[PDB]
Amino acid sequence: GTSQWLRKTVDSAAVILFSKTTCPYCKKVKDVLAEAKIKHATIELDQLSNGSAIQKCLASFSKIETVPQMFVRGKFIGDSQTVLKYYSNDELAGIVNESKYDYDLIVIGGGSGGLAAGKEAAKYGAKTAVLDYVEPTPIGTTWGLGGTCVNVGCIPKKLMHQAGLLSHALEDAEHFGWSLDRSKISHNWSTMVEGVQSHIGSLNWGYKVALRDNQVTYLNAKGRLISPHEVQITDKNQKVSTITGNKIILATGERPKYPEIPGAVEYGITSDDLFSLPYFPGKTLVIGASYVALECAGFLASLGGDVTVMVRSILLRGFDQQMAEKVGDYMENHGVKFAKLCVPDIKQLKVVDTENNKPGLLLVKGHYTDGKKFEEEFETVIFAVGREPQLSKVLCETVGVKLDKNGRVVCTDDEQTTVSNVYAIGDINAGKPQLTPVAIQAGRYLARRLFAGATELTDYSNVATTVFTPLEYGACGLSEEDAIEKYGDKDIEVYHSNFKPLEWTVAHREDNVCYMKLVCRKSDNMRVLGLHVLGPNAGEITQGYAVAIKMGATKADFDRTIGIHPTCSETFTTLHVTKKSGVSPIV
Amino acid sequence: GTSQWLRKTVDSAAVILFSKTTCPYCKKVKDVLAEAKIKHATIELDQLSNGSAIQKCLASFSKIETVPQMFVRGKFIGDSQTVLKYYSNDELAGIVNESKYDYDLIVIGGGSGGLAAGKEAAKYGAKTAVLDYVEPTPIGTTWGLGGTCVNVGCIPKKLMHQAGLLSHALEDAEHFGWSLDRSKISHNWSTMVEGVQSHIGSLNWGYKVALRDNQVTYLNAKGRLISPHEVQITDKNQKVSTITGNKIILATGERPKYPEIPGAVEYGITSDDLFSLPYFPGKTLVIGASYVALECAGFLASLGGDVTVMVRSILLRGFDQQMAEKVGDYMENHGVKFAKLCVPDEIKQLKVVDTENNKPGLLLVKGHYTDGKKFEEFETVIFAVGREPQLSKVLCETVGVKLDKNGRVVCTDDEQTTVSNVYAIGDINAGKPQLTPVAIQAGRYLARRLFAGATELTDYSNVATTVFTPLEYGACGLSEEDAIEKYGDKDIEVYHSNFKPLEWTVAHEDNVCYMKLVCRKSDNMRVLGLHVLGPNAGEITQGYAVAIKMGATKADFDRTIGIHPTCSETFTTLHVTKKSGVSPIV
């Protein structure tokens, strides 16, 4: 138990010192290591409940039971006198740097999870390399270090959402007494894209500075695992070479899919292209119905565009469908058009005017599920029909890393693959929520287990979400239909209410469009299984409740907690109308 | 135990039916009731663990052990055959309206707590009266039903705050690509006030409709408790009369204080006057440093006002003082002036308010700093120097209701006063947080205990707050200095971080928003207090109040995953401690 933890900790830590807080010889060694700029993990035995047992077990590697003890890459180096001997004879630097491999850790992929992993490992003395490369889109779009969220994901899309929200702030200002006239105000796409891209640029640079200041080697190159410890790299000049590493973290993410139809790749674009597009898209068709499709359609319409969404079957498959229909109804009432139960079968009418900074012109032909036809012209067509990894680019099949039927990596609950020294984090880890804070937590927690003797695992259950559509939708836990399927309708009670933000009263906005509900389990003390809210600032509302749901909140916990007034969130503390009762939820 | 609960429930319930969910005789009685429109409480014995014991105990009142049993005001009325007998003989209506008193419940005060209590009691058949009167301010201001929050508190102040927030939204819009020019846009005070007051009017009307639809008698009259069961009322024609009630709820609230200096009452105003003022205040002095003082100075500045705040000692006394200083520093950097360590001595009138042309007057303010140096013109002077009840106005001293040294009512943990049928809720309940949602919870829970046999008490601990200053401040639990005083500095660990809202990046400050968790080392790093300075701070704070109620630790925050991109997610990854000395900047 303790013995197996200690053996695992010693074998994989790069440089680790076993210590006690009260020990003067330990402080002498800490100071030497600090002077020579040798980074290392430290385990203070007096601060652990079984530190006495650990102390005795150390003798199985060192033949001594005393403290301090210093190890490098699985080898006992010495006690106080011996470490200082090596320091005085200028032998220490060579001892702590000798390794069977070029790196203690190679991270393939410089995005949300990979950068978090690599930085955290280097803190504990692991010699670390992070590899990142951005394969260009079909039209040639590329970007800098930081991954999908930073460059073509959460960051630009929420900034563009904020630009859309400010349109309603302009309308509301007149009712609150400000003298502007919203009717005579227009939006400039390229001005906003320039501001968004300058912020993304500051993030690209910040990550390069962070890696430098943690002594992490950054290679802007494509990585390919050719055996358990060997990574083949290809640089911007297509120069090929090989580097070796003890532990390997795969963190290469996904890219957008295109449907297999004529004209899609040639004449459409994806979210990869939209966030740096040099011209306003114009009249736009969005194909798909995921959160990416609806978020992009939403801000495009708020910025004055003529927007249509083509929906194969339902909106937001896998989310609570009552909430998904309320989201879509709001968008349709506020200027988004929908072509429902429809799929595309794309012709070019005009080439993109790269001179005068203007889109082209396209003819889209499709059909509905009953057989009727769709035919209409658009200036821009955006495909948002899912994302996929392409691990054949990354991972030679002879290495032995097992994939599932979707091409994602099959992992243990500590992110280990079928190859003992290789791990996977983020969007390519099969079965896990595909979110940036999940990738960051998995990467940091893994680095600590590998190089600092930590034990804590990442918890992937009940991870909260928010969809940043024009009216936002936050959620934590089960949808209502999944709860009913798992426990039966008679064991589920749902409390719900409409509400109206105080900010919407003077502005003459809608009375009964915002909505929230708690999905509860009767036979388990009215345990809250899922929380759902449609309204402004839905992510800020939802976050804090995710802590309560993690700790097992019941309806009675929500009832005994007092509201903050006036807020939207306080409506969760006084819910009382049940769905079974038939009483209206309106306000 | 069970017997003492049943005796208490039967004695004070107005109309109550003991019943079982599967009981056709019970269901037949339920139909006769409210076919005759008779409202009542119901207790389903098959849904309680000690329901068997309760059933046997009923026989001590009725001499029977079966269900249904109907009671009216402590008297057994009958089983199924007997109730139906009274119904078809037209004797039932008189039975259920028989009372020693005019009302089962009289509520003195029609605000947050009192309206909540009154509506809830009426749901279970209590014959209920709610009394409300608004004593005019020194300049004559008055308003409608609903209390301080609705008319001159949370509701108008947050709407004016939103008007102020929209100024920076107009600024931000240009950076996000919108073509407007903020420097050419101005604000019209009277247009704002008209919209705020139209919303307040819809609330006044909605409460009158709510009381009508619940069969509550609304008397627009001033009430005075003259004996345990007698309330003297004075109407708007100064006609005096007396009504009697079984239970009495005192819910009369507080009003603003003035300092005892020349010219204060005659020439200054308070928050009671500000929210319906027909002219813009102009150059304004706010005297005080409470949340009311800072919230009002903050939105006046954002709407284009020249505003100064006179601070006697510190900002937000009773709140975490690191947080209070950051709130004030932000205000001073964004155009609020502060006269620190200063108090007023006298207000002189230089011009009378110009009610024709709808303009303020002009005043000379004289005061002094704590070292003796002198302070010496403003168009408006607003006093925000605290609030107080005035129960020697509501409550004759011979009734026997005990007050504390501040004049608030000393209550048990079930809101009972020293007079057994008299209760108090809301701001006048000594020692309790003075907040609208607390008063509502206290009033509703009390009505259920009086008239439906409920047992649940209101929990007043760890109630979250938000100060709606220009940059908002939310909190739940102890301040850092209070935690250190209670447990010692070596048992307290503070995790903290600055942050920048993503919305602020394209809009161009980096390190002004701030958050911290104050934790107890020897209790598994229990979260004692949570604090956040930033946009939407009340929306951020609310959900965490549930987790703190359940006893959240630092480990609970760590294992919960963030939502990205939000401000709130910074709470899920905090790691810099104050003891480490590492900078919290980002």
Ligand SMILES: Cc1cc2nc3c(=O)[nH]c(=O)nc-3n(C[C@H](O)[C@H](O)[C@H](O)COP(=O)(O)OP(=O)(O)OC[C@H]3O[C@@H](n4cnc5c(N)ncnc54)[C@H](O)[C@@H]3O)c2cc1C
């Ligand atoms: C439009 C959009 C909006 C989103 N909005 C949100 C949101 O609001 N909130 C949220 O939580 N999540 C959001 N997400 C999801 C979030 O972006 C991902 O979950 C997250 O980026 C995944 O992190 P990762 O480390 O797994 O991969 P990535 O961040 O994709 O990083 C992987 C990196 O590795 C590189 N790479 C690939 N192959 C190789 C190779 N062979 N050699 C070297 N480098 C390679 C890739 O080019 C990329 O740079 C959004 C996603 C999209 C597409």
Ligand SMILES: Cc1cc2nc3c(=O)[nH]c(=O)nc-3n(C[C@H](O)[C@H](O)[C@H](O)COP(=O)(O)OP(=O)(O)OC[C@H]3O[C@@H](n4cnc5c(N)ncnc54)[C@H](O)[C@@H]3O)c2cc1C
């Ligand atoms: C400027 C300001 C801003 C505030 N902002 C907030 C905020 O954002 N959030 C929050 O939670 N709280 C806020 N509060 C506090 C909140 O208003 C009070 O806590 C709450 O209104 C108290 O409710 P109550 O029922 O105790 O009394 P009140 O709401 O004051 O109601 C008492 C009523 O009884 C009437 N009355 C008095 N004497 C008699 C009598 N003899 N006969 C009949 N009627 C009588 C009074 O005129 C009044 O109408 C604010 C307060 C102020 C002053």
Ligand SMILES: COC(=O)N1CCN(c2ccc(F)cc2)CC1
């Ligand atoms: C077909 O040849 C390849 O395998 N390549 C092409 C060159 N790539 C690259 C790497 C880094 C960079 F900055 C720009 C481009 C990597 C993959």
Ligand SMILES: COC(=O)N1CCN(c2ccc(F)cc2)CC1
């Ligand atoms: C000094 O004489 C009093 O006791 N008064 C005067 C009349 N007041 C009143 C009541 C209701 C109303 F709508 C307007 C005014 C009550 C208090």
Ligand SMILES: COC(=O)N1CCN(c2ccc(F)cc2)CC1
């Ligand atoms: C201390 O000042 C702030 O925090 N401000 C900055 C601007 N923000 C805002 C508010 C409403 C809106 F519609 C658009 C932007 C938030 C409030």
